[PDB]
Amino acid sequence: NSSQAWQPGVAMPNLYKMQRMLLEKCDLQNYGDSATLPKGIMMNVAKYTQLCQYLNTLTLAVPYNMRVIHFGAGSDKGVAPGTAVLRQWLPTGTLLVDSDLNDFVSDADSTLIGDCATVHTANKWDLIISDMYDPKTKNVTKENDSKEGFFTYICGFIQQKLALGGSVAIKITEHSWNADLYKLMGHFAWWTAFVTNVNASSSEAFLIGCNYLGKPREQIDGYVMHANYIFWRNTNPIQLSSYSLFDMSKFPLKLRGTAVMSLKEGQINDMILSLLSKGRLIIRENNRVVISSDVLVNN
Amino acid sequence: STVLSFCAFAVDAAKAYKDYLASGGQPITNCVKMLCTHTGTGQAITVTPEANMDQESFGGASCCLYCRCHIDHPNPKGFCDLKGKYVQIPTTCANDPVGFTLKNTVCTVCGMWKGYGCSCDQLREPMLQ
RNA sequence: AUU
Ligand SMILES: Nc1ncnc2c1ncn2[C@@H]1O[C@H](CSCC[C@H](N)C(=O)O)[C@@H](O)[C@H]1O
Ligand SMILES: [Cl-]
Ligand SMILES: [Cl-]
Ligand code: NA
Ligand code: NA
Ligand SMILES: [Zn+2]
Ligand SMILES: [Zn+2]
């Protein structure tokens, strides 16, 4: 509608998540169309700015020395526009690590080059952002089934390296999606599919998991939920808009100083789940942040 | 010993770029311009965009010739003063951020660019109530 | 998906 044009984007209404739609083609009335970006601003700076503007309205846990990891941070340009926006948005001092299959120049504290499947860490993270997208998905299309490349890695990374209370923003499209990732959204206190207004002509969305509970609060069928997502995109045209990019006065993420505790799994009662759900608690150890990128050795 | 003696006479990025622009070569593109209020302090290099009405804020790494060329920084520690920070560039020079960060210096006193904000060398103002 |  009209009032949506001034929002950073549109979140999938909850009623769509309760339907049992059959999958079919995503057909957008404005497919391909471009929005008018501010002078000299790259599409990904505008896209990440709107993603962050929407994340500001959620109950994200924001501790001191917050840990953020950004997958799919590189570009054919050789720079990291999204990382530059995340570093602008996040409190100063926040540890930011980014990664991509191809080499690039970044503002992150550390950058890992190689397939995400080669990335290891003995630490838990507070926020996981992924803009990963396989070129194979586009050039050569096929029956729209659940994709298992970098998505299997992200599902595993969320189940083992995300702190309880932590959140994720994972990029999906009509063809770049995974049934297990949708199932994992049921392991958060809340979730949605968010469409940036500057890219509303694309089937792209960010699956946002807010406050990880480490267990399913809802059983979600991933194939049905992606059909529900496509039904929403097909029946609710979103107008292309860059309007939210012109007011950056309340952009920075507020440093809430959210408590971090190293509680066991047997000390996670309903009282703790309630605090995790309001973004008032992070559960993980606070050891030295150690990351690495596997190197394939051969002659 | 003899390897560092050769490098201090051969590979010189700063010169090669200034001469490349002197020839007429297209300045490095894809510098990451940030969205900001343009009501900032206007300092040269900052932990967050601080552009004023007369400047553009860019991600530091994208405006560093050394970072963009994937070569070592010209200092022992190999530390970068732009990477992880934001550089404010005068709008009139925003077409070549890399060239601007090389040809100018930051005032260690006020933190503004020399000749583009730094007013530490102006005559003393009469005191104001 | 890197307008
Ligand atoms: N398996 C994988 N591991 C790591 N990176 C991957 C990957 N599959 C795809 N990617 C990366 O996903 C990226 C999608 S384009 C990303 C644009 C970037 N977020 C920006 O700020 O502009 C590509 O750079 C590609 O290299
Ligand atoms: Cl439309
Ligand atoms: Cl697959
Ligand atoms: Na910041
Ligand atoms: Na687009
Ligand atoms: Zn540098
Ligand atoms: Zn000065």
PDB file of C-alpha atoms in Angstrom, chain A residues 25-293:
ATOM      1  CA  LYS A  25       6.271 -19.614  -9.549  1.00  0.00           C
ATOM      2  CA  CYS A  26       7.008 -16.270  -7.873  1.00  0.00           C
ATOM      3  CA  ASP A  27       5.561 -13.694 -10.349  1.00  0.00           C
ATOM      4  CA  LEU A  28       6.158 -10.055  -9.230  1.00  0.00           C
ATOM      5  CA  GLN A  29       4.216  -7.206 -10.952  1.00  0.00           C
ATOM      6  CA  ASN A  30       7.374  -4.984 -10.896  1.00  0.00           C
ATOM      7  CA  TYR A  31      10.069  -7.677 -11.550  1.00  0.00           C
ATOM      8  CA  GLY A  32      13.448  -6.208 -12.658  1.00  0.00           C
ATOM      9  CA  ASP A  33      12.426  -2.532 -12.015  1.00  0.00           C
ATOM     10  CA  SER A  34      15.004  -0.301 -10.241  1.00  0.00           C
ATOM     11  CA  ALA A  35      14.386   2.237  -7.411  1.00  0.00           C
ATOM     12  CA  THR A  36      16.064   5.693  -7.461  1.00  0.00           C
ATOM     13  CA  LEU A  37      19.109   5.415  -5.160  1.00  0.00           C
ATOM     14  CA  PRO A  38      20.681   8.527  -3.562  1.00  0.00           C
ATOM     15  CA  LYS A  39      23.624   9.956  -5.610  1.00  0.00           C
ATOM     16  CA  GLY A  40      26.726   7.646  -5.630  1.00  0.00           C
ATOM     17  CA  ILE A  41      25.098   5.082  -3.280  1.00  0.00           C
ATOM     18  CA  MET A  42      25.560   1.376  -4.216  1.00  0.00           C
ATOM     19  CA  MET A  43      22.515  -0.957  -4.236  1.00  0.00           C
ATOM     20  CA  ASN A  44      24.012  -3.073  -1.385  1.00  0.00           C
ATOM     21  CA  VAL A  45      24.689  -0.006   0.819  1.00  0.00           C
ATOM     22  CA  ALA A  46      20.963   0.894   0.394  1.00  0.00           C
ATOM     23  CA  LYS A  47      19.860  -2.747   0.947  1.00  0.00           C
ATOM     24  CA  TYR A  48      21.914  -3.298   4.150  1.00  0.00           C
ATOM     25  CA  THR A  49      20.853   0.166   5.454  1.00  0.00           C
ATOM     26  CA  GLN A  50      17.162  -0.868   5.153  1.00  0.00           C
ATOM     27  CA  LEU A  51      17.918  -4.310   6.669  1.00  0.00           C
ATOM     28  CA  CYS A  52      19.596  -2.610   9.687  1.00  0.00           C
ATOM     29  CA  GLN A  53      16.765   0.020   9.951  1.00  0.00           C
ATOM     30  CA  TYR A  54      14.291  -2.886  10.281  1.00  0.00           C
ATOM     31  CA  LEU A  55      16.543  -4.855  12.748  1.00  0.00           C
ATOM     32  CA  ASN A  56      16.496  -1.691  14.973  1.00  0.00           C
ATOM     33  CA  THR A  57      12.708  -2.281  15.547  1.00  0.00           C
ATOM     34  CA  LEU A  58      13.277  -5.881  16.866  1.00  0.00           C
ATOM     35  CA  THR A  59      14.366  -7.194  20.331  1.00  0.00           C
ATOM     36  CA  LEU A  60      18.004  -7.904  19.297  1.00  0.00           C
ATOM     37  CA  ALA A  61      20.308  -8.715  22.227  1.00  0.00           C
ATOM     38  CA  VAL A  62      23.167  -6.117  22.121  1.00  0.00           C
ATOM     39  CA  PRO A  63      25.882  -6.947  24.705  1.00  0.00           C
ATOM     40  CA  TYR A  64      29.252  -5.182  25.244  1.00  0.00           C
ATOM     41  CA  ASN A  65      31.925  -6.786  22.961  1.00  0.00           C
ATOM     42  CA  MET A  66      29.057  -8.086  20.728  1.00  0.00           C
ATOM     43  CA  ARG A  67      30.127 -10.810  18.221  1.00  0.00           C
ATOM     44  CA  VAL A  68      28.848 -10.505  14.608  1.00  0.00           C
ATOM     45  CA  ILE A  69      29.814 -12.724  11.631  1.00  0.00           C
ATOM     46  CA  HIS A  70      28.933 -11.743   8.028  1.00  0.00           C
ATOM     47  CA  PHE A  71      28.833 -14.456   5.287  1.00  0.00           C
ATOM     48  CA  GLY A  72      28.718 -13.532   1.556  1.00  0.00           C
ATOM     49  CA  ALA A  73      30.387 -10.156   2.271  1.00  0.00           C
ATOM     50  CA  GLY A  74      32.367  -9.979  -1.031  1.00  0.00           C
ATOM     51  CA  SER A  75      31.305  -8.633  -4.469  1.00  0.00           C
ATOM     52  CA  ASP A  76      32.485  -8.554  -8.127  1.00  0.00           C
ATOM     53  CA  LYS A  77      33.630  -4.965  -7.224  1.00  0.00           C
ATOM     54  CA  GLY A  78      36.252  -6.387  -4.772  1.00  0.00           C
ATOM     55  CA  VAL A  79      34.891  -4.367  -1.781  1.00  0.00           C
ATOM     56  CA  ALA A  80      32.374  -5.093   1.050  1.00  0.00           C
ATOM     57  CA  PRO A  81      29.500  -2.517   0.965  1.00  0.00           C
ATOM     58  CA  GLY A  82      27.363  -4.550   3.430  1.00  0.00           C
ATOM     59  CA  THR A  83      30.269  -4.874   5.894  1.00  0.00           C
ATOM     60  CA  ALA A  84      30.803  -1.065   5.757  1.00  0.00           C
ATOM     61  CA  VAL A  85      27.067  -0.624   6.658  1.00  0.00           C
ATOM     62  CA  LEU A  86      27.172  -3.293   9.432  1.00  0.00           C
ATOM     63  CA  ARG A  87      30.254  -1.555  10.980  1.00  0.00           C
ATOM     64  CA  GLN A  88      28.385   1.812  10.789  1.00  0.00           C
ATOM     65  CA  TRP A  89      25.229   0.296  12.406  1.00  0.00           C
ATOM     66  CA  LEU A  90      26.919  -1.811  15.155  1.00  0.00           C
ATOM     67  CA  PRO A  91      28.298  -0.187  18.357  1.00  0.00           C
ATOM     68  CA  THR A  92      32.022   0.734  18.167  1.00  0.00           C
ATOM     69  CA  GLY A  93      34.107  -2.123  19.642  1.00  0.00           C
ATOM     70  CA  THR A  94      31.673  -4.793  18.301  1.00  0.00           C
ATOM     71  CA  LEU A  95      33.793  -7.662  16.854  1.00  0.00           C
ATOM     72  CA  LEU A  96      32.880  -7.993  13.140  1.00  0.00           C
ATOM     73  CA  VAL A  97      34.190 -10.947  11.055  1.00  0.00           C
ATOM     74  CA  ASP A  98      33.246 -11.263   7.375  1.00  0.00           C
ATOM     75  CA  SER A  99      33.718 -14.022   4.776  1.00  0.00           C
ATOM     76  CA  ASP A 100      33.298 -14.778   1.060  1.00  0.00           C
ATOM     77  CA  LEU A 101      34.307 -17.412  -1.510  1.00  0.00           C
ATOM     78  CA  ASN A 102      36.272 -14.674  -3.430  1.00  0.00           C
ATOM     79  CA  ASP A 103      38.965 -12.207  -2.246  1.00  0.00           C
ATOM     80  CA  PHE A 104      37.833  -8.649  -1.343  1.00  0.00           C
ATOM     81  CA  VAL A 105      38.842  -5.546   0.713  1.00  0.00           C
ATOM     82  CA  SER A 106      36.842  -5.167   4.008  1.00  0.00           C
ATOM     83  CA  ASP A 107      36.386  -2.909   7.085  1.00  0.00           C
ATOM     84  CA  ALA A 108      35.787  -6.020   9.270  1.00  0.00           C
ATOM     85  CA  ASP A 109      38.164  -6.851  12.195  1.00  0.00           C
ATOM     86  CA  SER A 110      38.992 -10.128  10.292  1.00  0.00           C
ATOM     87  CA  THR A 111      38.163 -11.500   6.794  1.00  0.00           C
ATOM     88  CA  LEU A 112      38.138 -15.231   5.807  1.00  0.00           C
ATOM     89  CA  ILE A 113      38.415 -16.133   2.050  1.00  0.00           C
ATOM     90  CA  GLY A 114      37.074 -19.539   0.846  1.00  0.00           C
ATOM     91  CA  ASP A 115      33.864 -21.643   0.860  1.00  0.00           C
ATOM     92  CA  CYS A 116      31.904 -21.015   4.114  1.00  0.00           C
ATOM     93  CA  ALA A 117      32.087 -24.839   4.654  1.00  0.00           C
ATOM     94  CA  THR A 118      35.863 -24.294   5.411  1.00  0.00           C
ATOM     95  CA  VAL A 119      35.165 -21.705   8.219  1.00  0.00           C
ATOM     96  CA  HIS A 120      35.679 -22.924  11.845  1.00  0.00           C
ATOM     97  CA  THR A 121      35.317 -21.196  15.245  1.00  0.00           C
ATOM     98  CA  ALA A 122      35.378 -22.438  18.875  1.00  0.00           C
ATOM     99  CA  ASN A 123      33.267 -19.372  19.862  1.00  0.00           C
ATOM    100  CA  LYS A 124      29.524 -18.608  19.854  1.00  0.00           C
ATOM    101  CA  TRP A 125      28.163 -15.528  17.990  1.00  0.00           C
ATOM    102  CA  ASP A 126      25.447 -12.980  18.923  1.00  0.00           C
ATOM    103  CA  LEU A 127      24.383 -12.118  15.329  1.00  0.00           C
ATOM    104  CA  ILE A 128      24.791 -14.022  11.997  1.00  0.00           C
ATOM    105  CA  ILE A 129      24.210 -12.105   8.702  1.00  0.00           C
ATOM    106  CA  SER A 130      24.336 -13.989   5.360  1.00  0.00           C
ATOM    107  CA  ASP A 131      24.074 -12.492   1.853  1.00  0.00           C
ATOM    108  CA  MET A 132      25.406 -15.766   0.316  1.00  0.00           C
ATOM    109  CA  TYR A 133      23.865 -16.653  -3.095  1.00  0.00           C
ATOM    110  CA  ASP A 134      25.220 -19.335  -5.521  1.00  0.00           C
ATOM    111  CA  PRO A 135      25.629 -18.044  -9.138  1.00  0.00           C
ATOM    112  CA  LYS A 136      24.606 -21.628 -10.224  1.00  0.00           C
ATOM    113  CA  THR A 137      21.080 -20.888  -8.784  1.00  0.00           C
ATOM    114  CA  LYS A 138      20.477 -18.214 -11.517  1.00  0.00           C
ATOM    115  CA  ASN A 139      22.408 -19.065 -14.763  1.00  0.00           C
ATOM    116  CA  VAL A 140      20.917 -22.643 -14.698  1.00  0.00           C
ATOM    117  CA  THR A 141      17.409 -22.912 -13.065  1.00  0.00           C
ATOM    118  CA  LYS A 142      15.563 -26.234 -12.270  1.00  0.00           C
ATOM    119  CA  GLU A 143      12.592 -27.688 -10.297  1.00  0.00           C
ATOM    120  CA  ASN A 144      12.384 -25.376  -7.242  1.00  0.00           C
ATOM    121  CA  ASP A 145      13.633 -27.854  -4.547  1.00  0.00           C
ATOM    122  CA  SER A 146      15.394 -27.104  -1.204  1.00  0.00           C
ATOM    123  CA  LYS A 147      19.073 -26.082  -1.932  1.00  0.00           C
ATOM    124  CA  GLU A 148      21.853 -27.854   0.119  1.00  0.00           C
ATOM    125  CA  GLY A 149      25.137 -25.975  -0.629  1.00  0.00           C
ATOM    126  CA  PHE A 150      26.042 -23.169   1.841  1.00  0.00           C
ATOM    127  CA  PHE A 151      22.554 -23.525   3.441  1.00  0.00           C
ATOM    128  CA  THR A 152      23.475 -26.866   5.092  1.00  0.00           C
ATOM    129  CA  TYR A 153      26.544 -25.086   6.572  1.00  0.00           C
ATOM    130  CA  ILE A 154      24.420 -22.123   7.899  1.00  0.00           C
ATOM    131  CA  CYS A 155      21.856 -24.524   9.498  1.00  0.00           C
ATOM    132  CA  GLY A 156      24.746 -26.308  11.283  1.00  0.00           C
ATOM    133  CA  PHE A 157      26.445 -23.012  12.271  1.00  0.00           C
ATOM    134  CA  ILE A 158      23.144 -21.749  13.819  1.00  0.00           C
ATOM    135  CA  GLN A 159      22.636 -25.024  15.800  1.00  0.00           C
ATOM    136  CA  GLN A 160      26.256 -25.068  17.176  1.00  0.00           C
ATOM    137  CA  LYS A 161      27.798 -21.532  17.028  1.00  0.00           C
ATOM    138  CA  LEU A 162      24.832 -19.181  17.761  1.00  0.00           C
ATOM    139  CA  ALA A 163      24.489 -18.031  21.411  1.00  0.00           C
ATOM    140  CA  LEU A 164      21.023 -18.467  23.003  1.00  0.00           C
ATOM    141  CA  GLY A 165      19.316 -15.034  22.615  1.00  0.00           C
ATOM    142  CA  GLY A 166      21.302 -14.437  19.397  1.00  0.00           C
ATOM    143  CA  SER A 167      19.659 -13.508  16.067  1.00  0.00           C
ATOM    144  CA  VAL A 168      20.185 -14.184  12.321  1.00  0.00           C
ATOM    145  CA  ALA A 169      19.379 -12.462   8.986  1.00  0.00           C
ATOM    146  CA  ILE A 170      19.850 -14.999   6.093  1.00  0.00           C
ATOM    147  CA  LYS A 171      19.247 -13.966   2.469  1.00  0.00           C
ATOM    148  CA  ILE A 172      16.876 -16.173   0.410  1.00  0.00           C
ATOM    149  CA  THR A 173      15.196 -15.855  -3.016  1.00  0.00           C
ATOM    150  CA  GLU A 174      12.545 -17.860  -4.898  1.00  0.00           C
ATOM    151  CA  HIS A 175      15.233 -20.408  -5.943  1.00  0.00           C
ATOM    152  CA  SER A 176      17.891 -19.824  -3.206  1.00  0.00           C
ATOM    153  CA  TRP A 177      16.181 -21.316  -0.099  1.00  0.00           C
ATOM    154  CA  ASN A 178      16.391 -24.335   2.243  1.00  0.00           C
ATOM    155  CA  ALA A 179      13.565 -26.267   4.002  1.00  0.00           C
ATOM    156  CA  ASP A 180      15.774 -26.950   7.107  1.00  0.00           C
ATOM    157  CA  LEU A 181      16.529 -23.207   7.476  1.00  0.00           C
ATOM    158  CA  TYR A 182      12.765 -22.461   7.603  1.00  0.00           C
ATOM    159  CA  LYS A 183      12.412 -25.309  10.157  1.00  0.00           C
ATOM    160  CA  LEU A 184      15.153 -23.634  12.295  1.00  0.00           C
ATOM    161  CA  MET A 185      13.140 -20.351  12.306  1.00  0.00           C
ATOM    162  CA  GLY A 186      10.851 -22.295  14.697  1.00  0.00           C
ATOM    163  CA  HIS A 187      13.846 -22.403  17.141  1.00  0.00           C
ATOM    164  CA  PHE A 188      13.697 -18.576  17.641  1.00  0.00           C
ATOM    165  CA  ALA A 189      11.274 -16.624  19.895  1.00  0.00           C
ATOM    166  CA  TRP A 190      10.098 -14.909  16.688  1.00  0.00           C
ATOM    167  CA  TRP A 191      10.917 -14.892  12.948  1.00  0.00           C
ATOM    168  CA  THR A 192       9.848 -13.274   9.667  1.00  0.00           C
ATOM    169  CA  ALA A 193      10.800 -12.840   5.989  1.00  0.00           C
ATOM    170  CA  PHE A 194      11.802  -9.176   5.413  1.00  0.00           C
ATOM    171  CA  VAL A 195      11.814  -7.484   1.974  1.00  0.00           C
ATOM    172  CA  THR A 196      13.833  -4.250   1.590  1.00  0.00           C
ATOM    173  CA  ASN A 197      11.855  -1.494  -0.177  1.00  0.00           C
ATOM    174  CA  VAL A 198      14.882  -0.712  -2.444  1.00  0.00           C
ATOM    175  CA  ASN A 199      14.835  -4.316  -3.827  1.00  0.00           C
ATOM    176  CA  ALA A 200      11.047  -5.019  -3.710  1.00  0.00           C
ATOM    177  CA  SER A 201      11.198  -5.965  -7.463  1.00  0.00           C
ATOM    178  CA  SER A 202      13.244  -9.085  -6.468  1.00  0.00           C
ATOM    179  CA  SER A 203      12.013 -12.368  -4.828  1.00  0.00           C
ATOM    180  CA  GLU A 204      14.897 -11.725  -2.376  1.00  0.00           C
ATOM    181  CA  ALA A 205      14.082 -11.601   1.348  1.00  0.00           C
ATOM    182  CA  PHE A 206      16.015 -11.899   4.612  1.00  0.00           C
ATOM    183  CA  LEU A 207      14.816 -14.744   6.871  1.00  0.00           C
ATOM    184  CA  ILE A 208      15.158 -13.118  10.294  1.00  0.00           C
ATOM    185  CA  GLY A 209      15.357 -15.291  13.425  1.00  0.00           C
ATOM    186  CA  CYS A 210      15.076 -13.124  16.577  1.00  0.00           C
ATOM    187  CA  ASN A 211      16.314 -14.551  19.961  1.00  0.00           C
ATOM    188  CA  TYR A 212      17.577 -18.172  19.495  1.00  0.00           C
ATOM    189  CA  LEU A 213      15.987 -20.603  22.026  1.00  0.00           C
ATOM    190  CA  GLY A 214      18.124 -23.640  21.028  1.00  0.00           C
ATOM    191  CA  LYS A 215      14.923 -25.743  20.644  1.00  0.00           C
ATOM    192  CA  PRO A 216      11.728 -25.677  18.513  1.00  0.00           C
ATOM    193  CA  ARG A 217       8.886 -23.512  19.934  1.00  0.00           C
ATOM    194  CA  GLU A 218       7.023 -24.421  16.696  1.00  0.00           C
ATOM    195  CA  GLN A 219       7.285 -27.347  14.221  1.00  0.00           C
ATOM    196  CA  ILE A 220       7.612 -25.721  10.761  1.00  0.00           C
ATOM    197  CA  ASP A 221       7.443 -27.592   7.418  1.00  0.00           C
ATOM    198  CA  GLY A 222      10.077 -25.758   5.297  1.00  0.00           C
ATOM    199  CA  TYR A 223       8.577 -26.673   1.873  1.00  0.00           C
ATOM    200  CA  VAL A 224       5.132 -25.333   2.941  1.00  0.00           C
ATOM    201  CA  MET A 225       6.617 -22.190   4.579  1.00  0.00           C
ATOM    202  CA  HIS A 226       8.542 -21.264   1.361  1.00  0.00           C
ATOM    203  CA  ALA A 227       5.267 -21.733  -0.614  1.00  0.00           C
ATOM    204  CA  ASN A 228       3.617 -19.379   1.961  1.00  0.00           C
ATOM    205  CA  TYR A 229       6.460 -16.851   1.410  1.00  0.00           C
ATOM    206  CA  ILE A 230       5.977 -17.015  -2.420  1.00  0.00           C
ATOM    207  CA  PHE A 231       2.151 -16.661  -2.002  1.00  0.00           C
ATOM    208  CA  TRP A 232       2.722 -13.479   0.055  1.00  0.00           C
ATOM    209  CA  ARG A 233       5.152 -12.026  -2.567  1.00  0.00           C
ATOM    210  CA  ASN A 234       2.701 -12.941  -5.395  1.00  0.00           C
ATOM    211  CA  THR A 235      -0.417 -11.364  -3.801  1.00  0.00           C
ATOM    212  CA  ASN A 236       1.127  -8.245  -2.129  1.00  0.00           C
ATOM    213  CA  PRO A 237       3.024  -6.043  -4.597  1.00  0.00           C
ATOM    214  CA  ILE A 238       5.595  -3.926  -2.699  1.00  0.00           C
ATOM    215  CA  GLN A 239       6.290  -0.474  -4.239  1.00  0.00           C
ATOM    216  CA  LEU A 240      10.027   0.220  -4.905  1.00  0.00           C
ATOM    217  CA  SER A 241      11.124   2.954  -2.436  1.00  0.00           C
ATOM    218  CA  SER A 242      14.407   4.527  -1.248  1.00  0.00           C
ATOM    219  CA  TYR A 243      12.579   7.010   1.073  1.00  0.00           C
ATOM    220  CA  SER A 244      13.892   5.490   4.373  1.00  0.00           C
ATOM    221  CA  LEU A 245      17.522   6.027   3.175  1.00  0.00           C
ATOM    222  CA  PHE A 246      17.170   9.857   3.499  1.00  0.00           C
ATOM    223  CA  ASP A 247      16.747   9.948   7.335  1.00  0.00           C
ATOM    224  CA  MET A 248      19.824   8.373   9.045  1.00  0.00           C
ATOM    225  CA  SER A 249      19.416  10.249  12.393  1.00  0.00           C
ATOM    226  CA  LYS A 250      18.240   7.144  14.378  1.00  0.00           C
ATOM    227  CA  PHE A 251      20.339   4.568  12.411  1.00  0.00           C
ATOM    228  CA  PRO A 252      22.974   3.309  14.943  1.00  0.00           C
ATOM    229  CA  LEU A 253      21.977   0.135  16.887  1.00  0.00           C
ATOM    230  CA  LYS A 254      21.448   1.208  20.559  1.00  0.00           C
ATOM    231  CA  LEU A 255      24.028  -0.454  22.883  1.00  0.00           C
ATOM    232  CA  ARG A 256      21.656  -2.123  25.431  1.00  0.00           C
ATOM    233  CA  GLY A 257      24.570  -3.779  27.307  1.00  0.00           C
ATOM    234  CA  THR A 258      22.587  -7.096  27.337  1.00  0.00           C
ATOM    235  CA  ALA A 259      23.806  -9.518  30.073  1.00  0.00           C
ATOM    236  CA  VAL A 260      26.001 -12.478  28.949  1.00  0.00           C
ATOM    237  CA  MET A 261      25.946 -15.646  31.153  1.00  0.00           C
ATOM    238  CA  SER A 262      27.654 -19.064  30.716  1.00  0.00           C
ATOM    239  CA  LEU A 263      24.639 -21.082  32.049  1.00  0.00           C
ATOM    240  CA  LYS A 264      24.566 -24.909  31.485  1.00  0.00           C
ATOM    241  CA  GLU A 265      21.787 -26.713  29.500  1.00  0.00           C
ATOM    242  CA  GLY A 266      20.235 -27.991  32.788  1.00  0.00           C
ATOM    243  CA  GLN A 267      19.867 -24.378  34.088  1.00  0.00           C
ATOM    244  CA  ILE A 268      17.657 -23.231  31.121  1.00  0.00           C
ATOM    245  CA  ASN A 269      14.212 -23.090  32.841  1.00  0.00           C
ATOM    246  CA  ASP A 270      11.094 -21.202  31.539  1.00  0.00           C
ATOM    247  CA  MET A 271      12.302 -18.053  33.431  1.00  0.00           C
ATOM    248  CA  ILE A 272      15.527 -17.994  31.281  1.00  0.00           C
ATOM    249  CA  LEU A 273      13.579 -18.699  28.001  1.00  0.00           C
ATOM    250  CA  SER A 274      11.372 -15.657  28.857  1.00  0.00           C
ATOM    251  CA  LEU A 275      14.472 -13.381  29.232  1.00  0.00           C
ATOM    252  CA  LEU A 276      15.997 -14.744  25.953  1.00  0.00           C
ATOM    253  CA  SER A 277      12.645 -13.985  24.166  1.00  0.00           C
ATOM    254  CA  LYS A 278      12.689 -10.242  25.158  1.00  0.00           C
ATOM    255  CA  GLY A 279      16.332  -9.792  24.043  1.00  0.00           C
ATOM    256  CA  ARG A 280      17.438  -9.343  27.696  1.00  0.00           C
ATOM    257  CA  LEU A 281      19.911 -12.279  27.850  1.00  0.00           C
ATOM    258  CA  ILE A 282      22.781 -13.920  25.859  1.00  0.00           C
ATOM    259  CA  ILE A 283      23.986 -17.433  26.877  1.00  0.00           C
ATOM    260  CA  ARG A 284      27.547 -18.393  25.842  1.00  0.00           C
ATOM    261  CA  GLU A 285      31.084 -18.258  27.297  1.00  0.00           C
ATOM    262  CA  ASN A 286      33.140 -15.044  26.776  1.00  0.00           C
ATOM    263  CA  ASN A 287      36.460 -16.729  25.731  1.00  0.00           C
ATOM    264  CA  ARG A 288      38.992 -15.326  23.192  1.00  0.00           C
ATOM    265  CA  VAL A 289      37.278 -15.116  19.731  1.00  0.00           C
ATOM    266  CA  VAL A 290      39.205 -17.610  17.488  1.00  0.00           C
ATOM    267  CA  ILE A 291      38.253 -18.200  13.782  1.00  0.00           C
ATOM    268  CA  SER A 292      40.017 -19.978  10.872  1.00  0.00           C
ATOM    269  CA  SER A 293      39.656 -20.842   7.139  1.00  0.00           C
TER     270      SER A 293
END
